Structures are given as C-alpha cells and as structure tokens.
Amino acid sequence: KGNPFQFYLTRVSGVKPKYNSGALHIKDILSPLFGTLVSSAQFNYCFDVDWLVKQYPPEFRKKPILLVHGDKREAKAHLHAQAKPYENISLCQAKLDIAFGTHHTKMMLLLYEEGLRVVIHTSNLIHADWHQKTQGIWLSPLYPRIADGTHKSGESPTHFKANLISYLTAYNAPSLKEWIDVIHKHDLSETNVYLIGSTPGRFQGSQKDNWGHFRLKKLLKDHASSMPNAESWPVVGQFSSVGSLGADESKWLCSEFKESMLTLGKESKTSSVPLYLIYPSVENVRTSLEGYPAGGSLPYSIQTAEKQNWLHSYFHKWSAETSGRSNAMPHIKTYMRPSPDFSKIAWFLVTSANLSKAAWGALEKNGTQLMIRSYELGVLFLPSALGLDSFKVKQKFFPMATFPVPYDLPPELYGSKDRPWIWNIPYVKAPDTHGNMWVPS
Amino acid sequence: KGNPFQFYLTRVSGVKPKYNSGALHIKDILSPLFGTLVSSAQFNYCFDVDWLVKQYPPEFRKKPILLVHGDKREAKAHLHAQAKPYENISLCQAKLDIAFGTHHTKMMLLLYEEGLRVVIHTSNLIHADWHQKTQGIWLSPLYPRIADGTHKSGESPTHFKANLISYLTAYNAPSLKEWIDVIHKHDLSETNVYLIGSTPGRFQGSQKDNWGHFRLKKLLKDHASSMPNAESWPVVGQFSSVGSLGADESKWLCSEFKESMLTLGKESKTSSVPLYLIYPSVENVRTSLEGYPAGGSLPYSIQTAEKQNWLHSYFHKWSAETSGRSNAMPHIKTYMRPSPDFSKIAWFLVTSANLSKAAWGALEKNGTQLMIRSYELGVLFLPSALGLDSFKVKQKFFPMATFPVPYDLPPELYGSKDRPWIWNIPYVKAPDTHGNMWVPS
DNA sequence: AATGCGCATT
DNA sequence: AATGCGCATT
The missing domain is CATH 3.30.870.10 (Endonuclease Chain A)
Incomplete structure (x- = not known):
C-alpha cells in the first residue's frame, strides 16, 4: 500500500499482535484480494500436500497447481501418492545431477486474470514452517499483461524479467516452458x-x-x-x-x-x-x-x-x-x-x-x-x-x-x-x- | 671380527681416514674375503648396471645376478636394455598394485660355497649413493649350510629365518622361490x-x-x-x-x-x-x-x-x-x-x-x-x-x-x-x- | 542418496 | 605414473 521494499515476515503464533500486524500468513498471500487466480506454480524442497491445498481459498482450490521438487524414488512416490487425490495438481521433478544437491528454491508464481505476481520466500510448504518461526518474503507487484498488439520488453533496469527467465530455462523441464511464455506476455518493468x-x-x-x-x-x-x-x-x-x-x-x-x-x-x-x-x-x-x-x-x-x-x-x-x-x-x-x-x-x-x-x-x-x-x-x-x-x-x-x-x-x-x-x-x-x-x- | 651389532656406514670420499677405518665400500662387501661367490641377488629402487657390475671382483663378475626392482614401462625398458650386454644378469619386477608405491627395499643375498650372507642397507645402487653420503649397513654372519641328513630349523630366537621367508613369499615372483629354498637349507640361528x-x-x-x-x-x-x-x-x-x-x-x-x-x-x-x-x-x-x-x-x-x-x-x-x-x-x-x-x-x-x-x-x-x-x-x-x-x-x-x-x-x-x-x-x-x-x- | 573431484612416491 | 579411498546436503 505504502512502502517500496515489499519485504515481509511470516505470522508467528504466540507473540503480542503488535508484531503480527504487518506480517503475512500463507492464506493472506493466496487471498482473493491479490486477484482472481487462474493457475499457480509452487517451487520448494518439502511439501505437505493436504495442508498446502487447505491454504488456498475454497474459490481457487480447484484451479491448477504445478509442484516443482527435486525428490527421487521413495521420497518421489510418497509425494506423487500424497498428491494423487487432487486431479488439478501436476508435478515437475528437477534434475539434480551432482550429488548431495537439493532443490531448495522457494517461489510462487501466481497467475491471475489481472496480471502476474512472483513471490520469493524462505519457508518450506509444511505447517511447522509457518507456525512459530522467523521467515522472509518478497512480493512483486501485480505485473499487468502486455497488450497483444503492443511490442514492449516489459523489462526493468534490474533486468529481472530476463534474469528470471534464464533461471527457468536452466531446468529444461517442458512443464515450465508454459511459465516462461506466461512471463513473456507480462510487464515486469516496475521491479526494483x-x-x-x-x-x-x-x-x-x-x-x-x-x-x-x-x-x-x-x-x-x-x-x-x-x-x-x-x-x-x-x-x-x-x-x-x-x-x-x-x-x-x-x-x-x-x-x-x-x-x-x-x-x-x-x-x-x-x-x-x-x-x-x-x-x-x-x-x-x-x-x-x-x-x-x-x-x-x-x-x-x-x-x-x-x-x-x-x-x-x-x-x-x-x-x-x-x-x-x-x-x-x-x-x-x-x-x-x-x-x-x-x-x-x-x-x-x-x-x-x-x-x-x-x-x-x-x-x-x-x-x-x-x-x-x-x-x-x-x-x-x-x-x-x-x-x-x-x-x-x-x-x-x-x-x-x-x-x-x-x-x-x-x-x-x-x-x-x-x-x-x-x-x-x-x-x-x-x-x-x-x-x-x-x-x- | 670383534663386535656384536654388525652395524656399519659407507666410506665417504673427502674426510680424514680416521673416519673410514671401520666403514665399508661396496667392493669391500663383495670381496673374495667374505667367501667364494656362486650367485647373488640384488633388491633395490635405482640401478646403474655398468657401475654395479664393476663393484664385484673380476673372479666373480660372470656369476649370476638377479635384479629385483619395481619399475615399469620406459623405466623398465631402460633397465632391461642397460642389462642386455650381460648374459648372467636376470630380472624380477615386483608387483606394485597400489599407486605411488615404490620398491624401496635395499638388500643383498650373497650365496657362497661356504654359506649364505644377508645384507640389509640404505643406499641405492648408483655411484652417487656410495660416494659422499652417510649410509647404513647390517651384515649377517656367514650362515653355514645345513647338512643334508640332519633335520634342524636353522632358526633364531628372533624368528628371522621365518620372518624373512614370509617377506619373500609375499612377492609371488617365481624367480624368488629359488631364494626361499636356498634360505631353507641354511642355518640362520646366530641372528640377534x-x-x-x-x-x-x-x-x-x-x-x-x-x-x-x-x-x-x-x-x-x-x-x-x-x-x-x-x-x-x-x-x-x-x-x-x-x-x-x-x-x-x-x-x-x-x-x-x-x-x-x-x-x-x-x-x-x-x-x-x-x-x-x-x-x-x-x-x-x-x-x-x-x-x-x-x-x-x-x-x-x-x-x-x-x-x-x-x-x-x-x-x-x-x-x-x-x-x-x-x-x-x-x-x-x-x-x-x-x-x-x-x-x-x-x-x-x-x-x-x-x-x-x-x-x-x-x-x-x-x-x-x-x-x-x-x-x-x-x-x-x-x-x-x-x-x-x-x-x-x-x-x-x-x-x-x-x-x-x-x-x-x-x-x-x-x-x-x-x-x-x-x-x-x-x-x-x-x-x-x-x-x-x-x-x- | 550414488558421481567425480582430489589425494597419494623417493 | 593410473586405482580406490574419502568427501559432499537441509
């Protein structure tokens, strides 16, 4: 509403409400307030899939999600099984070819009718990580869609649109080429x-x-x-x-x-x-x-x-x-x-x-x-x-x-x-x- | 002649003869004095084959030598070539299956008519190592041959005969089974x-x-x-x-x-x-x-x-x-x-x-x-x-x-x-x- | 979890 | 010289 940084913490259960006024819970992030969702994508290391789904508003809970993880084998089959009940959830394993490597990036892409929002944070997608811990959140502003006729890069002086795209192409997962093209049609110029x-x-x-x-x-x-x-x-x-x-x-x-x-x-x-x-x-x-x-x-x-x-x-x-x-x-x-x-x-x-x-x-x-x-x-x-x-x-x-x-x-x-x-x-x-x-x- | 240890140094060119009276040169080791040689064996890391041969007395220079080295490939072919002129010299590469390993043991077996002598020392077989350096030598005494009829271990309280044999069998080279049997026929009981x-x-x-x-x-x-x-x-x-x-x-x-x-x-x-x-x-x-x-x-x-x-x-x-x-x-x-x-x-x-x-x-x-x-x-x-x-x-x-x-x-x-x-x-x-x-x- | 970098003589 | 031991996440 007022500030330039867009830098927030997570809500912490058990402290004086003085401190949580101006912090955010995941539900506050996925609120209708921030636009009418069409589909999301969720990059992360750990996932409680049932809990996650309950964090979205009922209105949006049926709309597509892509999960992006690095797990393999039993970790994989547990995740795949845990997401079986939900027909809208898809998955994307990202390739970890060096050993002891993690898919540790925590990021939400959030597509709406009114634009795009990118959210880069530090919390895993399990209840324990949004409960009583100290976490970090950055919100983009709503990135308006680029008019179909007009030709504009949609880029900022920080080259964020181009730096983010490079990040996603580095995966090579087909499921993300959809999210590259989504970003290409959007104006990211306000990024500081x-x-x-x-x-x-x-x-x-x-x-x-x-x-x-x-x-x-x-x-x-x-x-x-x-x-x-x-x-x-x-x-x-x-x-x-x-x-x-x-x-x-x-x-x-x-x-x-x-x-x-x-x-x-x-x-x-x-x-x-x-x-x-x-x-x-x-x-x-x-x-x-x-x-x-x-x-x-x-x-x-x-x-x-x-x-x-x-x-x-x-x-x-x-x-x-x-x-x-x-x-x-x-x-x-x-x-x-x-x-x-x-x-x-x-x-x-x-x-x-x-x-x-x-x-x-x-x-x-x-x-x-x-x-x-x-x-x-x-x-x-x-x-x-x-x-x-x-x-x-x-x-x-x-x-x-x-x-x-x-x-x-x-x-x-x-x-x-x-x-x-x-x-x-x-x-x-x-x-x-x-x-x-x-x-x- | 007198002492119990049998512990000597090498002769050193360029010091007062006070110090080299009671030291040894390689020729003093291979002298006729120490018995009429039949064949020798020479274990070592480096070898100058021409110089080596000149260290034996003329009387004994045609009698067999086995060289025991660890070299391989070009080091090997150089050694093999360097020993080509001499029809009595044979060789035995010893197997070095772990990397960065050396065949570093320095030892002479010296077979005579009158017995066996084992000599364990610290000098390589090149001129530079017997010239102006400080080296160590141990001589066994002359080990008399065991009478063909008699049955005696020929062993000492230090179990040297048995400890030495174990050392040679550990190679697996056929050329040394001859030297194991040579040792078996000899009385090593005086070893301290x-x-x-x-x-x-x-x-x-x-x-x-x-x-x-x-x-x-x-x-x-x-x-x-x-x-x-x-x-x-x-x-x-x-x-x-x-x-x-x-x-x-x-x-x-x-x-x-x-x-x-x-x-x-x-x-x-x-x-x-x-x-x-x-x-x-x-x-x-x-x-x-x-x-x-x-x-x-x-x-x-x-x-x-x-x-x-x-x-x-x-x-x-x-x-x-x-x-x-x-x-x-x-x-x-x-x-x-x-x-x-x-x-x-x-x-x-x-x-x-x-x-x-x-x-x-x-x-x-x-x-x-x-x-x-x-x-x-x-x-x-x-x-x-x-x-x-x-x-x-x-x-x-x-x-x-x-x-x-x-x-x-x-x-x-x-x-x-x-x-x-x-x-x-x-x-x-x-x-x-x-x-x-x-x-x- | 299972690849490939760095190491080790006289 | 060229094998195999030890190492490296959140």
Missing part, C-alpha cells in the same frame, strides 16, 4: 530488486558470473558504489544450516566466499573486513517458543561441526527484539553489508541459500570452473536502483526508504558458556520452554 | 636382530601386525620391557624423504605413527613423549661435501611441504661429529628410543623406510585395515635378544656392547634462520661449498 540464482552444474569463463556468489560479486561490481573507508564496513551472514566449509577459513569462507561479498564498485583492491555470522546457540533453541523441537529445522550435524571449530569464533546469537522474534527461531537466510556504526547498509539480500558450498558454489580445477550442487534463489536490494547511496536501518521494525532489518544490530558474540545448536547430540541437562529434554532418536 | 618389513597391500585383523608400524608395535609389546618413567624417554626419527602426513599431527604422526614407536612391554597405557625429527636444513646442504647437489637425494617437494608447516617445529639439524659426517648428507634412515639424558637407548632400528605413510602404512575404513604402498625393510636391535635391559650410547663412534649411534645426541633444533631442504625451489642467494647456485631445471 535484482535476482540471484544458484542452479546445479559446473560453469566456465564468462559463465561463472551467471550463478552463485560470482553472480553477487558481478552485480556488486556493476551496480554498487565504493564507499570511503569501505574495508571497515563489515559483512553479515544469517542462516539456519551449515555445510562443510573445509579445514580452515582460507579454504573457502574468508577467501572465496568473503571476497565476492565485500566487492563494491568497478575499481578492485587486492583484508580485515569483519564477518559476523549469525547462528542460534543451544540456549536460543532451549528458551524458544517451541523449545528443542525448533532443532528440527536447524540441521547442523556433529560430524560436520567437529571438523571446523575454527568457524565457531565467528558465531553470534540470534537476537531480534526489533521484531519480538528472539524466541521464534530463524529459518530465513539473509546477508547484508552495514556501516561500522550499523546505522546504514549498502545492500540487503534475502535468499533461500544457506552457508554452504552446495548453495553458493565453490571453485574446482584451479580457479577455472565453479561447481554448484543445489537450486537456490533470492532478491537483492540495492540503493542504486532507488537513486540512493545507502539505505538507513529502521532502528525499530514497525521513515520512507529506510530498510527493515528483522534482527537486532549489532550482533552479540557467543559467551564462553555458549555452543552452537547441533541436532545430532542429546540435550539432557536443562529442560526446554515446555519442560522437555532432547534425545535424537 | 628382528626383521621389519613393509610389503604393499591392505591387511585386516591379525594380519595388520605382519607389516609396517604395527609390526614394530607388536615386536615392542612382545620383546621390550617397560622402563620406570618411560613417558619421559623420547622418540627419534631420522630420514631423507618426507611423504604427505596430512593437515595436522593428530591425523597420523602424533596419533598412529607415534603410538606404535613408544610402545614398551605387555601392559598398555592410554602423551607428552617428545619426538625429535631429523632432517637437513637448507644450510646443512649448502655447507655439505657436495653442496646443493646433495639436494638430489633429499626430495621434499614444495607442494608437500607447504601443506604441513606444523611438522617443521619438530625438525632438528643433521649433526654428526661423532662420525665426522656433519658435511656428508643423510640417505640413511634410523629410528631409536633414548633416555632423557641420552646416555642409553632401549632399542635401535635402521631401515629403508622414510617418514611416509607409503612406507610405514596408514589405517583405512575406520581402524579395520592398514594400507601400505611400498616395499621397505630393516633390522631392529633389541637388548632383550642380548640379555640386557638397555644399550649404552657410544659417546664417540670409534666398550663391549655399547651401541654405535652415527649422529650426535642430543639433536639440535632449527634456528629462526633455518628452513628445511626442499629441492623444488631455487637457492640463488648464497653459493654452496663449490661456489654454485641451485636452480631446479
């Missing part, structure tokens, strides 16, 4: 965000820029401006899962991943740019709204963790008084570049992607190719596409073009008592919010 | 050393004890005695090549390799046992008898080295005034367990084996199997097989059963200036003994 995809593969030369962290690096080179005293502006990475990052920080994180994030403006330098990583403590999960059960969505393995204790001295607490979400655990992923006083940020990103090489990609064969395992997707917010140099941090979440950060800044470092949440090991010592212990059976 | 082989493969259960460092561990359990204050007796490893030992000391060296070395007596404990590794500095090679050319036989690669700078704080200088060999570089390998004051040693080993997992073996598939790449071989000296508790270090090399250590004790740690010798990188800064620089072309 840049798209950031990861798609699986191994990419060489000029192709490395297309996906992953080289994509972010390129965008930041071409569309960010180098600030005075830039080296003192830190990086902040926020996530719910942790992949294997190697033997020490030089192997990937503080070399290859951090380079791409700190890039700003065309001129390149070749640092002590502080990196603050945010990941819930054991104690943040203990005192949570769910308690230890929140550990269900925080899958840091003990085997992965003990390999890399070096990482943990970069780890800071979940803390989100600005949203009243300190006890609603993070399944959102975000990355941003603040000023040293944290009053302003050069850019913000929300995405599906975790702190993993699978998701962001990592280099192979001596710097020549970039391998990515997983499908991911996010939107980047840049001041340059709003005629600004920086955003200003909304000191409290809920006054014009000041960006709404969901967590508290500055991040607070782990105490000596603190260790990170790990779902493999049993927490038997102190009980959770609801008087339970944790034994991963 | 234990044999220590590495042969290539992957070994499970009770088989792990047969080879490598599990072999040493087993021998030390069964035939050494646990001293009072044993944890304060250090370990000392001396070598010319360095394999890849992993990301840190826990991966192999200070866990798996060091355990096996410090074992003593049946009772097991489960430490700060100091480990002193001896490897020439850049400066030890610079000031050497050869100069930088000595770097030819010290093949520590820059790629291997930079992976493991942690190792280098265990590194001590080559220093051997006791032998007048400080400038003759080490191609010998030795390991031993001294007392904290270094006056006495629990045991001594000379061997072909370097500080590598290839040579010593390392564990796979979670502690169940031990993999070895290479063929190696040494003799272990134990006081228990001489009715003693310890040896006493010969304060100066050249008074009854005091053991002759070739290097100076205690070892001296690297200075801040010092770095290890590495043959990949160019030493262009200060000239060597003969006014040359080093550029590895």
Whole structure:
C-alpha cells in the first residue's frame, strides 16, 4: 500500500499482535484480494500436500497447481501418492545431477486474470514452517499483461524479467516452458530488486558470473558504489544450516566466499573486513517458543561441526527484539553489508541459500570452473536502483526508504558458556520452554 | 671380527681416514674375503648396471645376478636394455598394485660355497649413493649350510629365518622361490636382530601386525620391557624423504605413527613423549661435501611441504661429529628410543623406510585395515635378544656392547634462520661449498 | 542418496 | 605414473 521494499515476515503464533500486524500468513498471500487466480506454480524442497491445498481459498482450490521438487524414488512416490487425490495438481521433478544437491528454491508464481505476481520466500510448504518461526518474503507487484498488439520488453533496469527467465530455462523441464511464455506476455518493468540464482552444474569463463556468489560479486561490481573507508564496513551472514566449509577459513569462507561479498564498485583492491555470522546457540533453541523441537529445522550435524571449530569464533546469537522474534527461531537466510556504526547498509539480500558450498558454489580445477550442487534463489536490494547511496536501518521494525532489518544490530558474540545448536547430540541437562529434554532418536 | 651389532656406514670420499677405518665400500662387501661367490641377488629402487657390475671382483663378475626392482614401462625398458650386454644378469619386477608405491627395499643375498650372507642397507645402487653420503649397513654372519641328513630349523630366537621367508613369499615372483629354498637349507640361528618389513597391500585383523608400524608395535609389546618413567624417554626419527602426513599431527604422526614407536612391554597405557625429527636444513646442504647437489637425494617437494608447516617445529639439524659426517648428507634412515639424558637407548632400528605413510602404512575404513604402498625393510636391535635391559650410547663412534649411534645426541633444533631442504625451489642467494647456485631445471 | 573431484612416491 | 579411498546436503 505504502512502502517500496515489499519485504515481509511470516505470522508467528504466540507473540503480542503488535508484531503480527504487518506480517503475512500463507492464506493472506493466496487471498482473493491479490486477484482472481487462474493457475499457480509452487517451487520448494518439502511439501505437505493436504495442508498446502487447505491454504488456498475454497474459490481457487480447484484451479491448477504445478509442484516443482527435486525428490527421487521413495521420497518421489510418497509425494506423487500424497498428491494423487487432487486431479488439478501436476508435478515437475528437477534434475539434480551432482550429488548431495537439493532443490531448495522457494517461489510462487501466481497467475491471475489481472496480471502476474512472483513471490520469493524462505519457508518450506509444511505447517511447522509457518507456525512459530522467523521467515522472509518478497512480493512483486501485480505485473499487468502486455497488450497483444503492443511490442514492449516489459523489462526493468534490474533486468529481472530476463534474469528470471534464464533461471527457468536452466531446468529444461517442458512443464515450465508454459511459465516462461506466461512471463513473456507480462510487464515486469516496475521491479526494483535484482535476482540471484544458484542452479546445479559446473560453469566456465564468462559463465561463472551467471550463478552463485560470482553472480553477487558481478552485480556488486556493476551496480554498487565504493564507499570511503569501505574495508571497515563489515559483512553479515544469517542462516539456519551449515555445510562443510573445509579445514580452515582460507579454504573457502574468508577467501572465496568473503571476497565476492565485500566487492563494491568497478575499481578492485587486492583484508580485515569483519564477518559476523549469525547462528542460534543451544540456549536460543532451549528458551524458544517451541523449545528443542525448533532443532528440527536447524540441521547442523556433529560430524560436520567437529571438523571446523575454527568457524565457531565467528558465531553470534540470534537476537531480534526489533521484531519480538528472539524466541521464534530463524529459518530465513539473509546477508547484508552495514556501516561500522550499523546505522546504514549498502545492500540487503534475502535468499533461500544457506552457508554452504552446495548453495553458493565453490571453485574446482584451479580457479577455472565453479561447481554448484543445489537450486537456490533470492532478491537483492540495492540503493542504486532507488537513486540512493545507502539505505538507513529502521532502528525499530514497525521513515520512507529506510530498510527493515528483522534482527537486532549489532550482533552479540557467543559467551564462553555458549555452543552452537547441533541436532545430532542429546540435550539432557536443562529442560526446554515446555519442560522437555532432547534425545535424537 | 670383534663386535656384536654388525652395524656399519659407507666410506665417504673427502674426510680424514680416521673416519673410514671401520666403514665399508661396496667392493669391500663383495670381496673374495667374505667367501667364494656362486650367485647373488640384488633388491633395490635405482640401478646403474655398468657401475654395479664393476663393484664385484673380476673372479666373480660372470656369476649370476638377479635384479629385483619395481619399475615399469620406459623405466623398465631402460633397465632391461642397460642389462642386455650381460648374459648372467636376470630380472624380477615386483608387483606394485597400489599407486605411488615404490620398491624401496635395499638388500643383498650373497650365496657362497661356504654359506649364505644377508645384507640389509640404505643406499641405492648408483655411484652417487656410495660416494659422499652417510649410509647404513647390517651384515649377517656367514650362515653355514645345513647338512643334508640332519633335520634342524636353522632358526633364531628372533624368528628371522621365518620372518624373512614370509617377506619373500609375499612377492609371488617365481624367480624368488629359488631364494626361499636356498634360505631353507641354511642355518640362520646366530641372528640377534628382528626383521621389519613393509610389503604393499591392505591387511585386516591379525594380519595388520605382519607389516609396517604395527609390526614394530607388536615386536615392542612382545620383546621390550617397560622402563620406570618411560613417558619421559623420547622418540627419534631420522630420514631423507618426507611423504604427505596430512593437515595436522593428530591425523597420523602424533596419533598412529607415534603410538606404535613408544610402545614398551605387555601392559598398555592410554602423551607428552617428545619426538625429535631429523632432517637437513637448507644450510646443512649448502655447507655439505657436495653442496646443493646433495639436494638430489633429499626430495621434499614444495607442494608437500607447504601443506604441513606444523611438522617443521619438530625438525632438528643433521649433526654428526661423532662420525665426522656433519658435511656428508643423510640417505640413511634410523629410528631409536633414548633416555632423557641420552646416555642409553632401549632399542635401535635402521631401515629403508622414510617418514611416509607409503612406507610405514596408514589405517583405512575406520581402524579395520592398514594400507601400505611400498616395499621397505630393516633390522631392529633389541637388548632383550642380548640379555640386557638397555644399550649404552657410544659417546664417540670409534666398550663391549655399547651401541654405535652415527649422529650426535642430543639433536639440535632449527634456528629462526633455518628452513628445511626442499629441492623444488631455487637457492640463488648464497653459493654452496663449490661456489654454485641451485636452480631446479 | 550414488558421481567425480582430489589425494597419494623417493 | 593410473586405482580406490574419502568427501559432499537441509
């Protein structure tokens, strides 16, 4: 109605309604309000198909859905069976030819009579993920249909229409060529965000820029401006899962991943740019709204963790008084570049992607190719596409073009008592919010 | 003539004859003195076939030799061609089915009319290795032939006859069954050393004890005695090549390799046992008898080295005034367990084996199997097989059963200036003994 | 889940 | 030199 960012969280059961006024539930997303639906498409990793269908309004529940997943075999047959009762639901397996890869992108295409809406978010399609957790949502505006006679690209300065199409053609699934053509007939020119995809593969030369962290690096080179005293502006990475990052920080994180994030403006330098990583403590999960059960969505393995204790001295607490979400655990992923006083940020990103090489990609064969395992997707917010140099941090979440950060800044470092949440090991010592212990059976 | 150990060095050209009285050249080994030869066998890694043949006395030069190597293809055809002129020389390639494996064992079998002599040493069969270097030699005594009528094992308390046979059958080469039967007809009972082989493969259960460092561990359990204050007796490893030992000391060296070395007596404990590794500095090679050319036989690669700078704080200088060999570089390998004051040693080993997992073996598939790449071989000296508790270090090399250590004790740690010798990188800064620089072309 | 990258001598 | 061990998700 008023604001430029179109950036929202999910409704959280069990907090003061102060905080959920201006958040969204999935039903609010699929409301008649947002136009008379014709068909949808749902990209995601996990699906409760019965629950999902109940989230659409009765008026629209018979209209086609295409589900886009990466599952195979028994996971596949369970999904296919779970969707058998509904004659309007179709499916599209997306090809995951590298191992340990996930179809992790979370996105709704929503076709109406009145236009198109694209929605990029961070929540799985199961009840537990929209209940008591802290998630991220971006809404496009309604994209009007292009008149049949007229000839217009329907493109924005951020090249979003063209960046999104490239993302979908990369699948090769026939079921999506329908959704490419749908997008081609629609005017996407009002879009003020840049798209950031990861798609699986191994990419060489000029192709490395297309996906992953080289994509972010390129965008930041071409569309960010180098600030005075830039080296003192830190990086902040926020996530719910942790992949294997190697033997020490030089192997990937503080070399290859951090380079791409700190890039700003065309001129390149070749640092002590502080990196603050945010990941819930054991104690943040203990005192949570769910308690230890929140550990269900925080899958840091003990085997992965003990390999890399070096990482943990970069780890800071979940803390989100600005949203009243300190006890609603993070399944959102975000990355941003603040000023040293944290009053302003050069850019913000929300995405599906975790702190993993699978998701962001990592280099192979001596710097020549970039391998990515997983499908991911996010939107980047840049001041340059709003005629600004920086955003200003909304000191409290809920006054014009000041960006709404969901967590508290500055991040607070782990105490000596603190260790990170790990779902493999049993927490038997102190009980959770609801008087339970944790034994991963 | 007098002594019990039978432990010698090679003659070194360019030192005071004080030091070479009581050392040996290869011709001294193959002399008529040691019996009228019938045929020999020569196990080794590198061979100069023309030079070799010239080391035998003219009287014996026509008598059969079998060469035992691991080379294949062009290395093979070069060797086969190089031995073509001599109708008495035969060959035996030994099978190296794991990759990066070497046939590294250095041993002479020497058949005479009057008996058998086995000789286990550390020098390759090329002129450069017997010239100005510091090497190790063990001679058996003359093993008399067993009378055809009599029935006697010909075995010693150290089970050497049986340990050696097992070593040769492990090859499967038909050419060696002749040498097994030769050994079977001979009395090896006077042997006061234990044999220590590495042969290539992957070994499970009770088989792990047969080879490598599990072999040493087993021998030390069964035939050494646990001293009072044993944890304060250090370990000392001396070598010319360095394999890849992993990301840190826990991966192999200070866990798996060091355990096996410090074992003593049946009772097991489960430490700060100091480990002193001896490897020439850049400066030890610079000031050497050869100069930088000595770097030819010290093949520590820059790629291997930079992976493991942690190792280098265990590194001590080559220093051997006791032998007048400080400038003759080490191609010998030795390991031993001294007392904290270094006056006495629990045991001594000379061997072909370097500080590598290839040579010593390392564990796979979670502690169940031990993999070895290479063929190696040494003799272990134990006081228990001489009715003693310890040896006493010969304060100066050249008074009854005091053991002759070739290097100076205690070892001296690297200075801040010092770095290890590495043959990949160019030493262009200060000239060597003969006014040359080093550029590895 | 099951492919292909990186590794390992003297 | 060219085999097979170990690795990599949310």
